[PDB]
Amino acid sequence: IPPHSLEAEQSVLGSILLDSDVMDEVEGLLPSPEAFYAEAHRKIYAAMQALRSQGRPVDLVTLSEELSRRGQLEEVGGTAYLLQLSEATPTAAYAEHYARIVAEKWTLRRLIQAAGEAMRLAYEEAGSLDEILDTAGKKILEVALTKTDTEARPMRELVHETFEHIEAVRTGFKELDQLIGTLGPGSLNIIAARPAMGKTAFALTIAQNAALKEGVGVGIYSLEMPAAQLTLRMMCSEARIDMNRVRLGQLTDRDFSRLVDVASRLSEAPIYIDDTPDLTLMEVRARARRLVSQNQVGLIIIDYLQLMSGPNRQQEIAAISRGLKALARELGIPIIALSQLSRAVEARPNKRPMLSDLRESGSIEQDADLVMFIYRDEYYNPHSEKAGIAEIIVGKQRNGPTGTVELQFHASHVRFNDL
Template identity: 45%
Template structure:
């Protein structure tokens, strides 16, 4: 396999000599050229472009002087322009130059990682995946425009659906009021749900995941804190309205066994995938999601929880690492066209205030979480802190940031013995 194409490089340079305006369409940098002489010629073409001067054989010869003689002199420039069969091939030849350049830089980067003496295989794999992601991003076609006609027709279809469905499109959350405030979980968004311990983060995640599964979506759950079987305990307790303690101990009453069996039949029909490996890196999560997305396009991703994810490489401080992780999760949502919901831990600063309802500043090791997240919600139970509260068995879901919608607080019934959240207008059967 060749890691350069002199013919493609010659064609790019020759095409610009024949049609100088092509230099304004080119996004190549001089380093993309393998041949040193070609690199120098292109550098001078760029300089002439910046100075708004004409790009032709004479101006380049005058500018390069002796350096051109090392390449082959004016006759080489003339030969370049004569060697181009058609300038219509400029884009395809430019793409070949770019692809060869990415292959060379990728190979160099891999060699550097290999010679770096990594002793941790996870860190080594993370570095390789990071290189692959960068090359993949850079190799995409540069065309990013869409015609307004196409965009507005899509807008019409979305607005029409909203009118007749009565709500914004998106993936439903566990609560009607929460749907109204957030506009539901939208594709390509990163949604952070944060709380102090014992507020019900994991229960909230599982309630949402089961609802999405029942609606026919494929659900991916990354549980970095709890093993798979503990999640099943919680899912079954919430689905069957069986006390979670009896599920955990196996002490089901005779009448609960039938309910348990019926609940299993419902849950097993859902397309839910759970990965409970501890200490996953963000690169491993992205790779797993990409693989699952290929088999199941209609996907939603849940992560428990953000601060347990590893960055996969060295960082100067933990804030930088968490910022890198949140940015990677946002990229994952966009590249897989799916919502990503990640739980997050709050700092102990909450406990020091009289009003213990969380605020943005309470996000632990926040890094760029505020910037990257499309929505940030906090879970709060007043009955956890205040025995005499009027809000017993109520969970407050405080939407503090919503890039595309409103903010506010949704309240739901919190049936703690089942780990179940319910709208107020629901009644147990």
Template identity: 40%
Template sequence: MNEQTTFESKPRFKKRSEAPDIGQLFDRTPPHHIDAERSLLGSILLDPSVLMDTVQIVSSPDVFYKESHGAIFKALLDTYEAHQTGDLVQLAESLRARGVLEQIGGTTYLMELAEAVPSAANAPFYAKLIADSFRLRKLIDAAGEILFDAYNQGGGTPDAARGVIDTAEKRIFDIAQEDINAEPESLKELLHQEMERIDAADGKLISGVPSGFNDLDNLLAGFQNEEMTILAARPSMGKTAIALNIAEQIAFGGATPWQPKPDAKPVAVGVFSLEMARGSLTQRLLSSRSGVDSAKLRTGQVSDSEWQRLQQACDELAHAPIYIDDTPGMTILTLRAKARRMKQRYNIGCLVIDYLQLLSSPGSARESRQVEVSEISRSIKALARELKVPVICLAQLNRGAEQREGNRPKMSDLRESG
């Protein structure tokens, strides 16, 4: 005889026992949509084929607020997988075999569900209502854990608040990522888009964001949106210098004082400098633009003519849409949050990160450093796709390239990448 199951009246959440229940704290019932749950289950009973479309939106039984509805949905999934159908008889047998048929209301309740909707046409709409309520409940659950962390971990160390914020951002970001459901596109539509892109290119050698370096642009056709480009070298080889030159060229649309471009299209650039302070970067930009040696800028020993060149360079750079963030010890979660704000506030069209190995990832810090760097790299790639901008990421190489004939680097030479 099957063991009987008693359903809880409230949804189950995976949370720490110590974390506060926000619903009880504010004396509010969590967001839910029982009518939509009933209507969705009824739609599937009327037409089991809609289950395949529905499961892309409602991915698991846990999404349902009423646990008995989740049990019915699980049985429908298993029944459809086994028989490619899901009629009342098969569903009832599946629930009976699990020992939960009577707990969900018996066959009478299943029949009521089937009669709750006239057709299955609105199943995706019901599924979206259910999924949206579930995300709101997850946000409430995350808020409870954030409250718990803030009360119990805040103030213990100088960096306690930063740790709580990073964890909070990760929780919210994970929930936000679940909402990104890219629908598949037919090859026919993709081919149409590609032909339009080729036609728009009209023989242009640069289809992306131009770097201002002709040889590099000829190789890459410019920095492409949604792609991450690694700029790697051994320490003290000029990575930051060339990255700043590229950022400057992009911000001015490729125009320079000695080579004006009437059709220049400036692109806003966001620069994340984890190694060098913003003052040092500004000094480098001034030195590069004016042609005045940076050593003279540090000491202030400049001639009158050099001062005039500095003034002119300053006036020109003031119009460059370059935004610099030099927050030290940044995590990848913090960087992604800051990059989103940059995109929203300044409409940046390119990101520069200096440099990869100075970022940390709280989620994978307990693993090896190689695993952590790999996770950071994947996250930066995802950021490029999310913001739809090219990302230029600087990185350090280990000694592997120096020991190889010709000194030609490989991806495995990236320091701490494994």
């Protein structure tokens, strides 16, 4: 008994016949013929597009020519139906309006199908519970995130959307951003370093710059430390208070209000932290979808990869990174995954990481769009003069070349600042 609007479909086709220039507008809201419920209208529309795909004016004459060629001129109702579409509407000025109706009715049908797909998957019982729930959620979430079902999208549709976007997440580090640009939609980004190098501190800075400055929602999978503590660290770091040394009864009335103010700014940030300790890939996916749909979220951080479970430790990690790459794509947002490195990195004179070091943790390099390492000279040389300086080595990216960019690191309250 599927939702549709025969009148709106007719008005759309009819108003295109009255003025083929509305086709611009209409194709925006109705990119794919599948939007049309009536088999007939779907054939008509597909032919009207091909006529634009050939650049020849779409009217009552050329449409019959194109249809009868393919053969459906009678299927669609003859040129008499075509005639009726013309007169059944007095203007072309409302094209957009009727298209919005047709577009919306389709989404409902699209949802009906996705839901029915989930329902059919549960009955079958083929595949583990995790796999069922994963596909069920992917289908449903696709209805809201993808504009069509079309397997291969036409360039015209694609160009329209990219151009629409260029008439209108960043790391926040001005010099790094120059080198790598933004962390693109649907990308896996990897921050890898030896433990205690400051990946988390680094990641949380990005999280704050994105959420507080750019105003983009950011979800954190804090697999290692509990949410409560991660929150204390952000407050205390910002407010310049070493919570590990300084006790409560040792706070000045001044710097106390100071962290209440730092706590005020943080409290308004759209940062969501999930600290469930031992998540599988499937679980992270399932949670991500719930998070992303309940909240405006443009960034996800996994801290850190090696603490995730499997359903060979290299192969589990490689299956995880692959699944995260997929997730990023499915949601159209960047995902940061933090990664630990082997002691292997340290068994050589030049103790700084390089892309090669990653093949030790499986085929992870292949699925990461960006790879950034963190090296500090203080880590392997208590004396050595590069104290306050930390270096971020872009091992792999697509917006520019490789390169080491340097930032300030104050070990005191564990922060990263521009140079």
